[PDB]
Design a protein around this ligand. Structure first.
Ligand SMILES: OC[C@H]1O[C@H](O)[C@H](O)[C@@H](O)[C@H]1O
Length: 305
């Protein structure tokens, strides 16, 4: 009967496919239909809302492709008497300040970035690298707050553990995917021939994977590269390879919580005018590596299948 939308900026990522699967579970448990729409740019985003209105949807969960679309999304929704919940990426106003009025469910970005930096440093220590010939490559997406809090948290943790500040090189990526990060990393690598071992910092698996791919192209072997992604589910094809690579592991948060909980809160809101909390921060995280990924995914219910 009741129809609710679930709009995601990147349907190609397992992260978002997983949110969609758990949204469907909430739909089965509470009695609603989930309309799954891909919104990779702003145009499609606004058109998709129009489409939801025509289908008679009462609201939607959205991971916007652009935080700065916040105002427009809210205006359009209001126009159609639709409730909106943001997942993963927070809406911001024209000045870049957070739109605290839209309920949000997101991960603990700073805490998870710090964990990434802690685990990089620990693995570096395990390998015995000389810090003098080591460097950090931080691939950044500073226009996205959640991305920025992860990479800053990671660099802060490295600096706190003793990694020399002057050997931390930042490079912006134009797209949050393997091609964008590949290009970024490739430009930094040729600027630093003196480096023999790289730590690769990025806000998610694809970003780190593009960095790792670039290092392979510049003649670095796996032993001399450590990249730890974030998302978990996006790293399974890499961790499943026969041979080890510079991609050492991934921090697995809870996309299942993001998908179900945002959908459940939307339903309660639409069906009972039960007002969601403004901010829901999911703190769950576990390091998955070649040795435990299958066991940890099955144990979280996102099973190696
Ligand atoms: O909330 C986590 C989520 O954050 C952003 O949306 C990223 O683009 C996704 O890949 C995922 O890491």
């Amino acid at each position: 009967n009741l129809k609710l939308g679930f709009l995601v900026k990147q349907p190609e990522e397992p992260w978002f496919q997983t949110e969609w699967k758990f949204a469907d579970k909430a739909g089965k448990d509470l009695g609603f239909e989930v309309i799954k729409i891909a919104v990779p740019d702003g145009e499609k985003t606004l058109n998709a809302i129009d489409s939801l209105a025509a289908s008679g949807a009462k609201g939607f969960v959205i991971c916007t492709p652009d935080p700065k679309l916040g105002s427009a999304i809210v205006a359009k929704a209001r126009g159609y008497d639709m409730k909106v919940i943001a997942v993963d990426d927070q809406f911001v106003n024209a000045k870049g300040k957070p739109m605290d009025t839209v309920p949000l469910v997101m991960l603990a970005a700073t805490k998870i970035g710090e964990r990434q930096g802690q685990e990089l440093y620990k693995e570096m220590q395990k390998r015995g690298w000389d810090v003098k010939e080591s460097a950090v490559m931080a691939i950044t997406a500073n226009e996205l707050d959640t991305a920025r809090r992860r990479t800053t948290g990671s660099m802060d943790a490295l600096k706190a553990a003793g990694f020399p500040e002057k050997q931390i090189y930042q490079v912006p990526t134009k797209s949050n995917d393997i091609p964008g990060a590949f290009d970024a990393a490739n430009s930094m690598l040729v600027q630093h021939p003196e480096v023999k071992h790289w730590l690769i910092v990025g806000m998610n698996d694809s970003t780190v994977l593009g960095g790792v791919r670039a290092t392979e192209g510049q003649g670095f072997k796996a032993a001399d590269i450590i990249g730890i992604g974030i998302n978990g589910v996006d790293a399974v094809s890499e961790l499943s390879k026969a041979q080890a690579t510079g991609f050492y592991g991934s921090l697995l948060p809870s996309p299942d919580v993001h998908g179900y909980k945002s959908s459940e809160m939307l339903y309660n809101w639409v069906a009972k005018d039960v007002e969601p909390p403004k901010f829901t921060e999911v703190t769950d995280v576990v390091l998955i590596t070649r040795d435990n990924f299958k066991e940890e995914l099955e144990k979280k219910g996102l099973g190696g299948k």
